Design an enzyme around this catalytic site. Structure first.
Site: not given
Ligand SMILES: CCCCCCCCCCCCCCC
Ligand SMILES: CCCCCCCCCCCCCCC
Ligand SMILES: Fc1nc(Cl)c2nc[nH]c2n1
Ligand SMILES: Fc1nc(Cl)c2nc[nH]c2n1
Lengths: 346, 346
Positions: B15, B89, B202, B259
């Site tokens: 999320s 995770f 990056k 980036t």
């Protein structure tokens, strides 16, 4: 040999921002540096205020940099010659004032560094190629890379590539141009064509970058334009016989991403106004390199049968009053495709 | 077939900003989109305010996007599965909650799109490789490219690449992810390794970009860091068996230049403070991806004998209190060199 070379004299033909910036670079490697500028009245002014108030305001010139309107005195004794004269005036300069200069360069075997960028309208040839009509290749190298003049002039860390068919020629110029404090670092390459192609095409693409911004797009769009645009530089380089090794280097993607991210540049501003719906006529008050380069680029591309999607659409927007939004849709009408990049490793 | 594919349901595990942004993309191609988030209390909040106030504040979610803390209900019926769970995770999620998910995915042959980026510390493996320990490759693709979440979430023009060993697999996901208004365009490629490598490296390079800025350098320096840094991505990709075709594409240079030019990003800010002389301890108040990635990247590089000059120096500055200025000098102690790029054309 990574050992630097220092000279007694260097001459730079071209008094623009980049040319002056490079004169500053040379002032740290050459006891004397002459910068040729046609207007004598303006030359005196610059030498008085010790500042190129014409094209590099705010930067105090090293005391060993001297402007001059005398072509003969300018190159006399020089051990390296830089050309930064605009493309449209290059040929005429050699025909009308390069006679002895050329003889001297050949006689003394003086290295010549091409810093001019663009495409000659009458022949669709690049700067180094034009100069190659008067001077032999063994003495010709090209300088290209991400190098905003102000940063170069003030010694802010900068990297550029020096290209020459004969890598050994590039390596020697690399020993001359690289500074003692490692603030200006040069990398050798053989891809002269790729360098000249990238240096010209980047200005057209920068206008497209402006268009994208004036059209409401953000940084993702700019990154995509740079990545897809680089492929147009690659393809044109191939068609011109270039080896392409500079395409993904400093002169290629390096300078391209920098040039496309310079929001205050004229190429960007012109593109932004075009993206906002303003007609080119109204905008023209300022000749952006991208505008002048787009026509000959398109003609050269057509002549070689090289498809350049972005550059073609940018030409339409600039020269054929094409609606930016429609141009965009046409570009995307191609449909879902593969990225089109070959594998590097088998 | 350049004809788009629409689905009944899509599920996104993760999320975060990017995950939510991608959920917005899918809401235009899927009747229903579920976004899994562990904290049930926070899930209710997001569904109430119809806005991910946790990681994408300011963007109103499409009405057909529903957050949920129930893993089973989340993937149930989904016709495409996206993973955006943080690297640390990932494995634990599959071991503790992916049992049926995995079975379902295999049973129904549901395409899985890996959007997670980084390097697992314990195994030095990339996201798609980790997921590949639970799901078969034929169903695995990776999404990478210049794609700031805010721009993607609000539909601002964006281009990304979809990578899969089997190009046909990538092409199908390309038909699913590409939007009807051509605001999110996907390009197919086979270089999954290059994409994962570029996506991780990056972030480390972005810290170097910050360092350069905090050190007083300008945009020429940033352009050089991007160009030379890309070569480190290339070399590591080769050593990992990648084909490298993504290196100079959207996932490679495209995402890298974007980036490295995000001055407000945490990677940049951390790098800037480091360039200004602030110790890492003091800065740490904010875990930049670059900091967390630098250690495992260095260990993986050493393990494969891959020299990564910039990334190595960035690791020293971040983990070994090395003075930024000294790091810079060490980087430049190499001496004059050739650009080191192979020719593209013979
Ligand atoms: C000229 C307007 C700026 C365009 C914004 C960038 C879009 C990049 C996508 C190019 C895709 C070209 C398709 C290949 C034919
Ligand atoms: C980590 C500080 C930022 C460095 C500024 C960019 C310099 C790029 C030049 C890299 C040259 C590397 C030499 C190859 C060994
Ligand atoms: F700039 C500039 N340079 C040269 Cl060399 C010229 N010759 C005629 N006009 C010119 N303008
Ligand atoms: F974010 C995030 N995602 C997953 Cl999946 C987790 N599992 C434990 N902590 C976790 N934090």
């Amino acid at each position: 040999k990574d050992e630097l070379l220092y000279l007694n004299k260097a001459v730079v033909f071209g008094s623009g921002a980049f040319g002056t910036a490079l004169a500053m670079v040379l002032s740290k490697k050459c006891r004397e540096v002459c910068v040729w500028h046609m207007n004598e009245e303006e030359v005196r002014l610059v030498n008085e205020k010790r500042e190129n108030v014409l094209f590099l305001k705010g930067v105090q010139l090293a005391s060993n940099i001297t402007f001059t309107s005398d072509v003969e005195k300018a190159y006399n004794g020089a051990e390296i010659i830089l050309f930064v004269i605009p493309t449209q005036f290059l040929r005429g300069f050699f025909e009308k004032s390069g006679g002895n200069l050329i003889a001297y360069a050949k006689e003394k075997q003086v290295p010549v560094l091409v810093c001019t960028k663009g495409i000659e309208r009458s022949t669709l040839k690049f700067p180094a190629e034009i100069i190659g009509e008067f001077l032999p290749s063994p003495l010709l190298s090209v300088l290209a890379g991400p190098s905003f003049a102000i940063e170069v002039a003030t010694g802010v860390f900068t990297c550029v590539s020096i290209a020459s068919a004969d890598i050994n020629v590039a390596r020697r110029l690399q020993r001359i141009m690289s500074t003692g404090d490692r603030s200006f670092v040069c990398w050798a390459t053989t891809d002269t064509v790729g360098c000249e192609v990238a240096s010209a095409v980047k200005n057209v693409l920068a206008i497209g970058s402006g268009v994208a911004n004036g059209l409401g797009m953000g940084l993702n769009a700019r990154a995509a334009l740079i990545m897809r645009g680089l492929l147009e530089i690659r393809d044109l380089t191939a068609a011109l016989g270039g080896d392409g090794s500079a395409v993904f280097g400093l002169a290629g993607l390096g300078d391209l991403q920098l040039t496309c991210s310079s929001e205050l540049s004229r190429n960007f501003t012109v593109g932004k106004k075009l993206g906002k719906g303003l007609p080119i006529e109204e905008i023209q008050r300022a000749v952006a390199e991208g505008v002048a380069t787009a026509d000959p680029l398109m003609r050269l591309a057509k002549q070689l049968k090289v498809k350049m999607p972005l550059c073609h659409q940018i030409y339409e927007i600039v020269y054929k009053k094409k609606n930016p939004r429609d141009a965009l849709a046409d570009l995307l009408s191609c449909g879902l495709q593969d990225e089109g990049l070959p594998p590097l490793f088998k």
